[PDB]
């Protein structure tokens, strides 16, 4: 279904019947990071199956509640392009958030670390991105522009809101884990193969710090409709640049590193949310 | 949409040939804000895209839909006022049709303009950049306009893109700029295509600069590939309508309106430049 | 086209298994101009793609050839399926997954490529030791879509994709047979095609670390590694990429076919000699 104003309105009005929470903040949990949703108080869990026109080991959830005093909606489980979903499908949930009242989107993901100074388990705040699929004609906004949401040619300047980035740094710092925190450029590989050593070396040389297969499409849709964005990568593996190495990325090890840092990351987001300006 | 095969292209061309007697030798495509390169056409016939079967519609700002026939500096031209962009959702076949139609109408030379962001740090706002080469990012990544059964009536399966930007036309365009006092606005460089429609991020721009690109835009390469594929010679120029931002901490941003504005300020100079080039084209 | 799922792949494989009794351990795919690597196949059964349900056309059909080579049972794809032709992911994936159900353990592939690396000569062989998948990075990876669990994992790693023991063997064989000087190893980058690369594109690909550029192969290799088939791949340098926009020299497919024809017999001999020394 086209992520136009009519269909987005439908989905949003349905949800608005199943809950009274008007979210100001939207959160999306990446691979292995579903715990950032567990401190949500007065929560209402709505499975994607109960929502008409949302998409689909079992189902994902839309979770409404409060976190550090603020109203949030959490997407437990995202939609990936490598899974075969259309642009309209990936766009819809973000545009639905927009109509629910979301002003700030906070997204996490798991990524490989390209930058040679990164360690396993480090956090990399995104300050910029390289959208390889978008450069190559698979940008999520290809097609008729939905004018009710935003402009035909969006600019991506300050896409990773620099005030949110500064606040995220300051909160890490004050809570004793500033040393895990970096800022860098995320490049998206459509996937689903991990990157070869040749591909990793090339991505590093283009100026990329972390690589993953998600996140950019959601961020583009969010900036398109004027939602502010904060995004962080968990370094769940170190990319291998050397073809003679036996070390390889493995999705279980990604989930495992996720599980080890999920609580620290959950705590981080909650503390950030507590310090967000309230108007 | 309709396959850009010899049968369908013939239909469209024969229809147009009923609405006009002009046999074009030169085809012209106007980029964003550059519609005025068409206003000096004498003895003109304006045919809206709507009055042509199987042509598209165009819904972009700064692109009306007209096919304009007439003479320019003594030569017969057809002018696409308004082009078709991939970032709009159009198929390969839809973008390839108008250029293949030009081929059947008689076009030998194709002159294209477009608005672009300047990556090269020596470029100034309002500069002209003649394309001498391109980097077709969508084409490298399996979105080449020629993907699919080769239409043999038009060209070969594996076209070479050597001298795609005909070097004699580039030499002539430079000489004409020089003689008419605006040589200092003219550069030559490599155009890279971003599928779009997002403007490029600072990290994308930095990467594009480092790959050897001088200007970036979201058009043009597909049309050039179709034109070379069927043996049409090509001249192409970017207007620098903004300077790409390489620094993430900057507040400056690209804006469509400013692109249209810069286009408007230079459109007359560019029109004059094309007319002067066409006047010196060899004639048989 | 038909989903390359376990049900459909099983159908195609069971049909083939009625037309022949050969259980292949080794699969071979011939690139542009290289169809002769299939002519030494003894006790051969030629099955045209037309006589297989749900296989494609590469029209004028090619052939699936079963037989023995240097003592081993092989299946040969004479003629491959190219993304620039408009085939779906499922169509390119199916033949390789069929091989997997037929018993293939090792896949040997050849292709024609442009030489980017400035030390390459026309007619050189470049063994692939790694590959840049430009379409794959750009959301046209052959595995995009529901993962077919019966064949492989959701997120395959491509470490040792170009099996290093097969590469070492191939080198030793070239060496012992007097043509070690034609053999290099490098990185292959895929251009979706079908336009040859511009000089600015070539210069960029060279600078990214690429040794050869072609419009095929990587998708098949991804499907093969995904289902645990081991891979050996070689490019014939059939032209020298032009980096200079002022040059009049250009790639043309006839010259590609011509170089292929000149080297096809040496390459066929190379493959047969490699297969002879495969562990049994
Ligand atoms: N090294 C890596 N390269 C690309 N994606 C990764 C990497 N490590 C974790 N991921 C992410 O986690 C899943 C694959 O493990 C995907 O959703 C992907 O985005
Ligand atoms: N900085 C830029 N990057 C990519 N395309 C641009 C830029 N400036 C103008 N354009 C072109 O003009 C329109 C965007 O304003 C598109 O059609 C695109 O081709
Ligand atoms: N210089 C080259 N660049 C990209 N593909 C090539 C090149 N030379 C031969 N090929 C291959 O052979 C055909 C083009 O001649 C294609 O199938 C392609 O895979």
- Beta bridge partners of residue B233, listed in sequence order: B109
- To one decimal, the resolution in angstroms is 2.3
Give the residue, by CA position, lying nearest to ligand 2 atom 1: B117
Q: Containing H/E element for B237?
A: strand B233-243
Q: Write the CA distances from B111 to B131, B236, B274, integer angstroms.
A: 11, 6, 8
Nearest CA of chain A to the CA of B210: how many Å?
Answer: 8
Alpha-carbon gap, residue C229 to C221, rounded angstroms: 9
Alpha-carbon gap, residue B280 to A226, rounded angstroms: 51
Residue B201 is encoded by which pair of tokens?
């991020």
Whose CA is closest to C224, among C232, C213, C214? Answer: C232
- Produce one character per residue of A157-175: b if its CB has 16 or more CB atoms within 10 Å, e if not: bbbbbeebbebbeebbeee
Torsion of CA C8, C9, C14, C16, to 10 degrees: 120
Q: Write the CA distances from B154 to B26, B96, B232, integer angstroms.
A: 18, 11, 11
Q: Cite the DSSP H helix spans in C137-234.
A: 164-176, 199-207, 218-226
- Strands (E) in A3-94, as ranges, are 25-29, 41-47, 61-67, 70-76
Alpha-carbon gap, residue A57 to A150, rounded angstroms: 36
How remote is the CA of residue A251 from the centroid of ligand 1, in Å? 7
Alpha-carbon gap, residue B238 to B213, rounded angstroms: 13
Nearest CA of chain A to the CA of B274: how many Å?
Answer: 28
DSSP string, B119-138: -STT--TT-EEEEEEEEEHH
Q: Write the CA distances from B160 to A277, B220, C252, C253, C262, integer angstroms.
A: 58, 17, 7, 9, 22
Method: X-ray
Spell out which residues of chain B touch residue C197, defining contact as CB-CB under 8 Å: 161
Alpha-carbon gap, residue A73 to A25, rounded angstroms: 6
Whose CA is closest to C117, among C239, C215, C32? Answer: C239
Establish whether residue B158 lines the binding site of ligand 3, counting it when its CB lies within 6 angstroms of any ligand atom.
Answer: yes
Alpha-carbon gap, residue C253 to C244, rounded angstroms: 20
- Strands (E) in chain C, as ranges, are 26-30, 42-47, 63-69, 72-78, 106-115, 125-133, 183-190, 212-214, 230-240
Spell out which residues of chain C touch residue A205, defining contact as CB-CB under 8 Å: 208-209
Which of C251, C254, C263 should be mutated for ligand 3, with most atoms under 8 A from CB? Answer: C251
- Identify the residue whose tokens are 């009274």: A20
C-beta separation of B215 from B240 below 8 A: yes
Establish whether residue C216 lines the binding site of ligand 3, counting it when its CB lies within 6 angstroms of any ligand atom.
Answer: yes
3-state helix, strand, coil in chain C (%, to 5): 35, 25, 40
- Identify the residue whose tokens are 């040679």: A116
Establish whether residue B209 lines the binding site of ligand 2, counting it when its CB lies within 6 angstroms of any ligand atom.
Answer: no
Whose CA is closest to B141, among C141, C218, C82, C223? Answer: C141
Helix (H, G, I), strand (E, B) or coil at A165: helix
Question: Phi, psi (5° rounding) for residue A249?
Answer: -70, 150
Q: Do A185 and B194 touch (CB under 8 A)?
A: no
Chain breaks in chain C following residues, C–N > 2.5 Å: 59
DSSP string, B194-206: ---SSPPPHHHHH
Q: Do A138 and C140 touch (CB under 8 A)?
A: yes
Q: Do A192 and C141 touch (CB under 8 A)?
A: yes
C-beta separation of C66 from C24 below 8 A: yes
Alpha-carbon gap, residue A58 to C2, rounded angstroms: 27
> Which atom of ligand 2 is nearest the CA belonging to B194?
4
Q: B187 an active-site residue?
A: no
Alpha-carbon gap, residue A193 to C140, rounded angstroms: 11
Alpha-carbon gap, residue A163 to B181, rounded angstroms: 48
Alpha-carbon gap, residue B136 to B142, rounded angstroms: 10
Q: Which of A88, A129, A134, A140 to mutate to test the interface with B (most CBs of B within 10 A)?
A: A134
C-beta separation of A27 from A36 below 8 A: yes
The CA-based diameter of chain A, rounded to the nearest angstrom, is 57
DSSP string, C61-114: --EEEEEEETTEEEEEEES---GGGT--HHHHHHHHHHHHHHT--EEEEEEEEE
Task: Note the Cα C186 to chain centre separation in Å.
Answer: 15
Nearest CA of chain A to the CA of B66: how many Å?
Answer: 21
Under 8 Å CB-to-CB from C96, ≥6 apart: which residues? C27, C107, C220, C223, C224, C227, C229
Binding-site sequence positions of B for phosphate: 32, 63, 83-85, 115, 219
Domains belonging to chain C, first-starting first, are 1-280 (3.40.50.1580)
Q: Which of A136, A140, A145, A208 to mutate to test the interface with B (most CBs of B within 10 A)?
A: A136
Residue A225 is encoded by which pair of tokens?
């409709």
- How many residues in chain B? 284
Q: Do A142 and B194 touch (CB under 8 A)?
A: no
| Interfacial C residues in 199-218 facing A (CB < 8 Å) | 208-210
Alpha-carbon gap, residue A126 to A211, rounded angstroms: 11
Whose CA is closest to B135, among B193, B196, B220, B200? Answer: B193
Binding-site sequence positions of B for inosine: 115, 199, 218, 241-242, 256
Whose CA is closest to A159, among C159, B201, C217? Answer: B201
Alpha-carbon gap, residue C46 to C25, rounded angstroms: 17
Task: Report which DSSP code applies to B63.
Answer: B
Task: Report which DSSP code applies to B60.
Answer: B
Among the options B4, B38, B80, B218, which is catalytic?
A: B218
């Amino acid at each position: 279904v086209t992520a136009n104003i009519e269909n987005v309105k439908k989905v949003a009005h349905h949800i608005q019947k199943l809950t009274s929470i008007v979210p100001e903040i939207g959160i999306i949990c990446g691979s292995g990071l579903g715990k950032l949703a567990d401190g949500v108080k007065d929560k209402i869990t709505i499975p994607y199956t109960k929502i008409p026109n949302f998409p689909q080991g079992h189902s994902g959830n839309l979770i409404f509640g409060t976190l550090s005093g603020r109203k949030v909606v959490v997407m437990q489980g995202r939609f990936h392009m490598y899974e075969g979903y259309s642009n309209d499908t990936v766009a819809l949930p973000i545009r639905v958030m927009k109509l629910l009242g979301v002003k700030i989107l906070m997204v996490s993901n798991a990524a490989g670390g390209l930058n040679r100074s990164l360690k396993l388990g480090d956090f990399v705040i995104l300050k910029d991105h390289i959208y390889l699929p978008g450069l190559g004609l698979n940008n999520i906004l290809v097609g008729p522009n939905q004018e009710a949401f935003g402009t035909r040619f969006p600019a991506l300047s300050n896409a990773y809101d620099r005030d949110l980035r500064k606040l995220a740094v300051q909160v890490a710092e004050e809570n004793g884990f500033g040393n895990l925190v970096h800022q860098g450029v995320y490049v998206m590989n459509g996937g689903p193969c991990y990157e070869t050593p040749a591909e990793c070396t090339m991505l590093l040389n283009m100026g990329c710090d972390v690589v993953g297969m998600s996140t950019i499409p959601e961020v583009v849709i969010a900036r398109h409709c004027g939602i502010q964005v904060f995004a962080v990568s968990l370094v769940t593996n170190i990319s291998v640049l050397d073809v003679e190495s036996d070390l390889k990325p493995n999705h279980e090890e990604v989930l495992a590193t996720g599980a080890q840092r999920a609580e620290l990351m959950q705590s981080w987001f909650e503390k950030i949310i507590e310090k967000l300006p309230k108007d």
